[PDB]
Write a protein that binds this DNA or RNA. Structure first.
Lengths: 836, 183, 100, 103, 49, 48
RNA sequence: CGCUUCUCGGCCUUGUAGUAUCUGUUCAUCAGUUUAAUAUCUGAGUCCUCGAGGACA
RNA sequence: AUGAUGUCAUACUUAUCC
């Protein structure tokens, strides 16, 4: 597969056709890389495996020699990068002692993955450095990575710090401690100590909550940098304290203890970024102190906190913001003091159009404001920010809107007075009437506001729903779906207040849009109908179901991901609840239409589908519909079938399977194999759902499992084995064990194979058989296999014997046989032979 | 460091269960004691095989499965076959299926606790040891004798069989009802 | 599970944080990965639920809405008395789908 | 499509020998992979018993070299005249003669 | 030796293998020489040539 | 020359059964089947 | 004893992970490594001529 | 008459996934 015009430089050796005459042939055959980089997806797959199994063969040297240039390529893609990352992982699951010379030679390319805009790139990078460090040795990593500490560029120092974070997560803090503790005391130059401290931080972020045990030692390291003559070291130091305390869940306060007294002092004398950093640290600290000591100390911090609102620094504003959250979100702080001193400057400087356009500042601002509401109360905050709902820009409106949302979510709408409530509803409608983008914030916002107001909202309905219909035209593509969803979430409120005319409106009006050709709208429409069904009942539906349901029936062709979803859902609600209003003929047509809905690429679609199919199975009764399931061609191998199997299960539940089984068991006869294993699955899920009731049917299924478990082809043994499992859990304790032993006979030979699905299947099988039969019989099959020095039987029988061993280890005692004692050892336990 | 098979068989009290792979274990005495237990089961025969106990039935195309009499006496199989022929409904009864599931319930042929599944387990339909004096019905039909089987007339002349010396067959030294003409 | 075989669980110490399930993974079991017979609720680890890691789904890892529960087949097989089955690793799933 | 596997080629040769030559619909109902026009094209291109699939000589090369200049297009007209009659071996031989004489 | 399956496929009785399509069973005629392995069964059924 | 077939079948293996008239076996399975055979039982009955 | 014709009858018109069965393919001598058994690294009179042949002990 | 490996289709599983 083709070569980009640049990649020639790398792959030129492949171009020449000289062939068939040692190492040069290994580099030459190693161009399978090219097949991984560019080509068809299958070529990438097969190539990837082929190079995985050749790891031990080719060795890490030639590979990395032929890779690292590519992953270093200036023209590298996104995908190609990620794929080469994959091959590096998969080969590094194998090679262990081999990589030692290349470790640095790896990290140099990989460390740039840690600092990246892409998140998935970062989690990948952390993963592969974890695999590398754990793969190599500790001393390998340490002795490797020293010279990058004092490197002139700070880039490598930084990304190297995150590297030490990852490797420290791998091999644990205490192993790597003396290295660090040695580093931060290095007397050569400051840059080192700066690095090592940054390492402390990135360890704090990465490990997070798990820092807890070594917190003391870590602090004892870092403390000496706060007083250092250099500035950076001080700044990054206190920052690292911050990260610690933030991962320091409400405890280890005294471990930070000796750190405080300098910090507070510094709080006085500092100008610039370092100051803000200290404020960050102290900020995360205060929640960890005692409300008495933290009373004083807090009251001291509040002053500077006030004074420093006004700085243009955005780092500043972030810090002091989150600070205000923690300091003023303290239970030991008085409302009125905040109400006077803080709120007016807070809404003055902080609420502006510089903030909201940014992302982090947006969020953090939301949170802090939410908490201030949590203390001073509701009507204050909201009352001050309502007037901004009507502000021009979107993002700002979005901000105050979600703020109001969370506020009225927590505190409740009860505190709100009347006039401010008028400004509320008008604000929310007005903001909702202009929507540049589609998003939930405005909608969830409105819904939460109304559901919180309760029936105080009643005078406002006609304005609401007037807007709802007029908007319900305007633009279908953009706003139809949105006004529809608005109805959906406002259903219950439009119900409990007992406005019936409005339910007539929404009922037939929405009924009319079911002919809408745009799917993304229609979906929202059906959703709205759904929500309306859950408030007003069956027989009171203003569009009587006789009208509605057959009008729904043809829509199932619609392909669309949202239409199919909501549609099938609603057919489910009505098919489950009333179900009498519609004649059976319509129903069976619904069936023959439902059958091909199982091509859905989405799992929830199939979910609702099968459950519905059960409901209508109740509405009619088993035989016909289970026959219509058995009609299935099985045509698709990758699933698309076994959902029908699930329908066979649930159908067998909805009316007693005590009826249904003979039809199925007969339908195993058919020579077509894939449907044979199909009905095997049907038995599996069947027993999984029936549980206890299998105390009878075990016998019926027993000989057929004999026929199936006796192998035509592996899938028979597998699926049948799964059946044995779920049967074995289900029947437990009821006294049927005998036939389960018989079936265990035929289960037992299948123990040996390398196919993952059949071996894990058999494992589940013998586990369920363990609990059902009891360990004694198991162990009596597992004894002789232990001994076997043959590199197979011992592997397996010891795997089994372990599975039997972990559970029920208490009950095994009696069943260990008598084993005679040799020369040096006494192998007879004589306690059991004490006789009265 | 490892004892031979003859020394392990002479030391064991039950040498009819020792195998060739048990000498390569770490403790042959405990393995020989555990293999000679009362209600113990042996390991599967796929410990040394390389077919993974499921690849030997490649060309075998026998009946996929067989329904029981309690399902065949309900008429659901013929209705399902008619529905499959129409596609390529019935509503026969609702209490007859409950009667076939409860009253007309047939207990299936189970197996013993030591009856493990073999590799083939279909061509070795062994059954006790139908010996001298005891035969099956049909072969009576081929023989066609109304209720001795007539070559125990020649077991008069030529003598009692060398193969089963303990023999008695009716009317000769064994002084018989139904099928079984000798013990 | 049956969908992702290369995924590894957390298996950490059990805390007092009750587990939750996302709206896309609602009703699915954690160990058995089934939809029927819920018997025991899911408990999360202490490090697995802290700050932004609280209120997240165990299997899906997205925004959790309803509380997750374990299957009765996994409860009777003593598969629910193990550690916290939080999905930590995420490999060969939702990686190439972001590019398309 | 039209991979033209060997097991499909033997079945197409058996269908051409058993059913006939001027019945393309009868031969396409026993393969389940190609249509009748594709089966007739395969029978006229590779499954024909009179096709000379080998023995490329200098007389045929001189005949094709003294014909591509008189008619530059219409290689299908010179297919039966040159003697190859495969409608693709002539273009392949022309490409080989153009690549070998270029160096 | 050609036998039909219950799912629209062919299965070889003499070769004791599966056939994916109709061309697969039609290509195990010249190949899959199970006919030459029937000489032992022909000698066991009849001792004379 | 079926060298691989004789190696997989277990041919050219040193084995001898002294109970079966001091006969030699070319394999371990052949030595196990020759120890319980007609000639071995006849020699055991003639030995007493 | 052999051959040609004629008659009558017995009668055949998509993106990823993993798995197997089909079909082509074939299975220089000691010692240990390894493997269920298989393969393996290392090991082995003089002269002449082009591994082979001849001569001598 | 199994088994061996290897080019090469074909089905199946993973409730695989936009």
């Amino acid at each position: 597969p083709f070569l980009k015009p640049d990649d020639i430089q790398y792959f030129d050796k492949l171009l020449v056709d000289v062939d068939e005459s040692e190492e040069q042939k290994e580099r030459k055959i190693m161009k399978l890389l090219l097949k991984i980089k560019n080509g068809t997806p299958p070529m990438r797959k097969a190539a990837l495996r082929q190079i995985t199994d050749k790891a031990r063969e080719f060795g890490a040297g030639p590979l990395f020699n032929q890779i690292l240039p590519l992953l270093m390529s200036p023209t590298l893609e996104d995908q190609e990068r990620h794929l080469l990352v994959k091959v590096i992982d998969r080969i590094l699951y194998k090679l262990d002692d081999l990589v030692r010379p290349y470790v640095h030679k790896i990290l140099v390319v990989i460390e740039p993955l840690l600092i990246d805009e892409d998140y998935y790139a970062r989690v990948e990078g952390r993963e592969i450095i974890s695999n590398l460090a754990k793969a190599a040795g500790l001393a390998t990593m340490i002795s490797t990575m020293r010279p990058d500490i004092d490197n002139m560029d700070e880039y490598v120092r930084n990304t190297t710090a995150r590297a030490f974070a990852v490797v420290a997560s791998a091999l644990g803090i205490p192993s790597l401690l003396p290295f660090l503790k040695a580093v931060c005391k290095s007397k050569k130059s400051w840059q080192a100590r700066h690095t090592g401290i940054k390492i402390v931080q990135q360890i704090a972020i990465l490990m997070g909550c798990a820092i807890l045990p070594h917190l003391r030692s870590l602090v004892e390291i870092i403390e000496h940098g706060l007083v250092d003559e250099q500035q950076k070291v001080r700044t990054i130091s206190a920052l690292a304290i911050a990260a610690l305390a933030e991962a320091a869940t409400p405890y280890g306060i005294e471990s930070f203890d000796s750190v405080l007294k300098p910090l507070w002092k510094g709080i006085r004398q500092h100008r610039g970024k370092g100051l803000a950093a200290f404020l960050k640290a102290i900020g995360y600290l205060i929640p960890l102190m005692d409300a008495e000591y933290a009373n004083y100390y807090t009251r001291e911090v509040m002053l500077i906190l006030i004074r420093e609102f006004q700085s243009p620094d955005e780092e500043m504003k972030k810090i002091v913001l989150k600070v205000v959250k923690q300091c003023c979100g303290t239970d030991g702080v008085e409302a009125n003091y905040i109400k006077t001193e803080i709120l007016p400057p807070f809404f003055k400087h902080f609420w502006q159009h510089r903030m909201a356009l940014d992302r982090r500042n947006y969020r953090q601002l939301v949170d802090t404001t939410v908490e201030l509401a949590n203390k001073v109360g509701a009507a204050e905050i909201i009352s001050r920010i309502v007037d901004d709902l009507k502000d021009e820009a979107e993002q700002y409106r979005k901000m105050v809107m979600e703020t109001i949302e969370k506020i009225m979510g927590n505190l409740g709408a009860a505190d709100i007075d009347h006039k401010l409530e008028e400004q509320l509803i008008d604000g929310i409608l007005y903001a909702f009437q202009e929507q540049t983008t589609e998003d939930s914030v405005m909608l969830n916002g409105f819904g939460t506001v109304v559901n919180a107001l309760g029936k105080r909202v009643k005078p406002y309905l006609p304005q609401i729903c007037g807007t709802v219909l007029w908007r319900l035209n305007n633009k279908s593509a953009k706003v139809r779906q949105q006004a529809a969803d608005l109805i959906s979430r406002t259903a219950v409120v439009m119900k409990t207040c007992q406005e019936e005319k409005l339910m007539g409106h929404l009922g037939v009006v929405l009924y009319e849009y079911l002919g809408e050709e745009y799917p993304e709208v229609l979906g929202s429409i059906l959703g709205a109908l759904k929500a309306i069904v859950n408030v007003i009942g069956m027989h009171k539906m203003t569009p009587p179901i006789k009208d509605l349901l057959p009008r729904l029936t043809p829509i199932l062709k619609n392909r669309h991901e949202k239409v199919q979803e909501n549609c099938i859902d609603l057919v489910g609600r009505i098919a489950d609840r009333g179900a009498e209003y519609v004649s059976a003929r319509e129903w069976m047509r619904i069936c023959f239409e439902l059958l091909e809905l199982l091509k859905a690429h989405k799992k929830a679609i199939r979910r609702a589908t099968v459950n519905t199919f059960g409901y209508i199975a109740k509405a009619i009764g088993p035989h016909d519909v289970l026959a219509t399931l058995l009609n299935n061609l099985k045509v698709q191998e990758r699933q698309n079938r076994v959902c029908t199997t699930v329908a066979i299960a649930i159908v067998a539940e909805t009316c007693s399977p005590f009826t249904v089984l003979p039809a199925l068991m007969n339908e195993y006869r058919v020579p077509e194999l894939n449907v044979q294993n199909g009905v095997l699955k049907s038995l599996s899920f069947l027993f999984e759902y029936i549980g206890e009731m299998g105390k009878d049917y075990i016998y019926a299924v027993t000989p057929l499992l004999e026929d199936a478990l006796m192998d035509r082809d592996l899938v028979h043994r597998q699926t049948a084995s799964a059946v044995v499992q779920h049967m074995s859990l289900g029947v437990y304790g009821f006294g049927c064990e005998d036939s389960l032993n018989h079936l265990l006979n035929y289960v037992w030979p299948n123990v040996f194979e390398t196919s993952p699905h059949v071996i894990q299947a058999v494992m589940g099988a013998l586990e369920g058989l363990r609990v059902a039969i009891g360990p004694c019989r198991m162990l009596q099959y597992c004894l002789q296999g232990l001994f076997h020095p043959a590199r197979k039987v011992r592997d397996v029988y010891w795997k089994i014997y372990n599975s039997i061993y972990i559970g029920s280890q208490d009950a095994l005692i009696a069943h260990y046989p008598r084993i005679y004692n040799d020369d040096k050892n006494t192998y007879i336990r004589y306690e059991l032979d004490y006789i009265l | 460091n490892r004892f031979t098979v003859a020394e392990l068989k002479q030391l064991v009290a039950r040498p009819d269960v020792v195998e060739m792979h048990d000498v390569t274990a770490q403790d042959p005495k405990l393995l020989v004691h555990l293999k000679a237990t009362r209600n113990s089961v042996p390991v599967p025969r796929h410990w040394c095989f390389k077919r993974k106990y499921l690849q030997g039935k490649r060309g075998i195309e026998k009946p996929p499965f067989e329904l029981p009499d309690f399902i065949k006496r309900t008429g659901i199989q013929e209705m399902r076959e008619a529905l499959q022929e129409k596609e390529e409904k019935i509503d026969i009864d609702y209490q007859k299926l409950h009667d076939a599931f409860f009253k007309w319930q047939t207990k299936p042929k189970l197996t013993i606790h030591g009856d493990l599944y073999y590799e083939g387990k279909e061509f070795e339909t062994r059954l006790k040891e139908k010996k001298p004096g005891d035969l099956s019905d049909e072969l009576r039909i081929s023989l066609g004798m109304p209720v001795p089987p007539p070559w125990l007339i020649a077991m008069q002349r030529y003598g009692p069989p060398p193969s089963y010396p303990n023999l008695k067959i009716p009317g000769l030294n064994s002084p018989l009802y139904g099928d079984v003409f000798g013990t | 599970a049956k969908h992702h075989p290369d995924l590894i669980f957390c298996r950490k110490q059990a805390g007092v944080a009750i587990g939750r399930l996302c709206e896309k993974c609602d009703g699915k079991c954690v160990i058995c990965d089934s939809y029927v017979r819920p018997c025991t609720l899911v408990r999360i680890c202490d490090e697995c639920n802290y700050g932004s890691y609280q209120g997240r789904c165990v299997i899906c890892g997205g925004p959790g809405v309803s509380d997750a529960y374990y299957c009765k087949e996994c409860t009777i097989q003593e598969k629910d008395r193990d550690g916290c089955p939080k999905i930590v690793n995420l490999g060969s799933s939702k990686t190439d789908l972001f590019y398309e | 499509g039209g991979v033209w596997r060997n097991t499909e080629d033997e079945i197409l040769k058996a269908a051409v020998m058993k059913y006939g030559k001027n019945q393309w619909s009868r031969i396409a109902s026993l393969l389940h992979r190609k249509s009748a026009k594709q089966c007739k094209a395969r029978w006229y291109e590779w499954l024909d018993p009179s096709i000379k699939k080998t023995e490329w000589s200098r007389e045929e090369e001189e005949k094709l070299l003294h014909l591509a200049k008189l008619m530059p297009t219409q290689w299908r007209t010179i297919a039966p005249i040159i003697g190859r009659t495969a409608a693709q071996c002539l273009e392949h031989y022309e490409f080989l003669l153009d690549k070998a004489a270029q160096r | 030796y050609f036998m039909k399956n219950h799912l629209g496929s062919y299965e070889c009785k003499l070769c004791l293998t599966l056939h994916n399509n109709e061309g697969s069973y039609l290509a195990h005629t010249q190949g899959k020489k199970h006919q030459t392995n029937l000489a032992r069964r022909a000698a066991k059924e009849a001792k004379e040539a | 020359i079926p060298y691989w077939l004789y190696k997989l079948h277990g041919l050219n293996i040193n084995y001898n059964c002294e109970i079966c008239g001091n006969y030699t076996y070319r394999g371990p399975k052949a030595f196990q089947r020759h120890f319980a055979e007609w000639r071995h039982a006849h020699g055991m009955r003639c030995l007493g």
